[PDB]
Design an enzyme around this catalytic site. Structure first.
Site, PDB file in Angstrom:
ATOM      1  CG  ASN A 144      -4.018   8.014   5.852  1.00 23.57           C
ATOM      2  OD1 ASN A 144      -4.786   7.053   5.743  1.00 23.57           O
ATOM      3  ND2 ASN A 144      -3.169   8.144   6.868  1.00 23.57           N
ATOM      4  CD  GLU A 149      -8.422   2.399  -3.800  1.00 17.93           C
ATOM      5  OE1 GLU A 149      -7.636   2.397  -2.827  1.00 17.93           O
ATOM      6  OE2 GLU A 149      -9.233   1.480  -4.024  1.00 17.93           O
ATOM      7  NE  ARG A 198      -3.450   2.580   2.459  1.00 13.70           N
ATOM      8  CZ  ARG A 198      -4.351   2.927   3.373  1.00 13.70           C
ATOM      9  NH1 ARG A 198      -4.691   2.078   4.335  1.00 13.70           N
ATOM     10  NH2 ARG A 198      -4.906   4.132   3.328  1.00 13.70           N
ATOM     11  CG  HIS A 199      -0.252   4.667  -2.122  1.00 12.56           C
ATOM     12  ND1 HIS A 199      -0.604   5.641  -1.214  1.00 12.56           N
ATOM     13  CD2 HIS A 199      -1.391   4.328  -2.771  1.00 12.56           C
ATOM     14  CE1 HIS A 199      -1.901   5.881  -1.309  1.00 12.56           C
ATOM     15  NE2 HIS A 199      -2.401   5.098  -2.248  1.00 12.56           N
TER      16      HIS A 199
END
Length: 171
Positions: free
Chosen positions: A14, A74, A7-8
């Site tokens: 976020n 995504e 996951r980047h």
């Protein structure tokens, strides 16, 4: 097939709690730090990556030179891109939580998202490291019967399409 899904690193959305799909946000300083920590912690295998900035940049700082594939992106939230999770319509919230019957206006349905992701994985003929997104890792984890939530800049190794091998999170 042994596959390592990463996951980047984190972006601003976020911490802000906003749906982040095809909106091409950059990594935050800490996001880049999370990426650097991955270098040396990931196996030396061929690499593939979502073509979105945050993923490519994670792959780079992690020490890889991946082949870019939009299929690893995504899910496209369409008109819901940037929407605060908090104020998301209950129907969309539940569809995302239960991971089913999700169809954002102007975006990708969960069904199409899964088909895109799984078709890409099925095409992989040998072990590899995949720099991708939370929704992609979640789709894979859920399909393997597990909770699909993983921290930004963390990784999960799976024996696709049979089981999860390990989840790796670094502080």
């Amino acid at each position: 097939m042994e596959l390592w899904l990463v996951r980047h690193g984190e972006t601003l959305w976020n911490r802000e709690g906003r749906l982040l799909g095809w909106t091409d946000l950059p990594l935050t300083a800490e996001g880049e730090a999370q990426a650097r920590r991955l270098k040396g912690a990931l196996p030396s295998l061929p690499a593939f990556s979502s073509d979105l900035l945050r993923a490519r940049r994670t792959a780079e700082l992690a020490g890889f030179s991946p082949r870019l594939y939009p299929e690893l992106r995504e899910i496209h939230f369409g008109a819901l891109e940037g929407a605060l999770w908090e104020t998301l319509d209950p129907r969309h919230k539940e569809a995302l939580l239960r991971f089913q019957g999700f169809h954002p206006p102007g975006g990708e349905s969960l069904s199409a998202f899964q088909e895109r992701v799984f078709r890409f994985l099925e095409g992989l003929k040998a072990p590899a490291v995949l720099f991708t997104h939370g929704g992609v890792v979640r789709a894979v984890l859920r399909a393997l019967g597990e909770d699909g939530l993983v921290p930004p800049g963390s990784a999960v190794a799976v024996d696709w399409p049979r089981r999860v091998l390990v989840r790796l999170a670094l502080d």
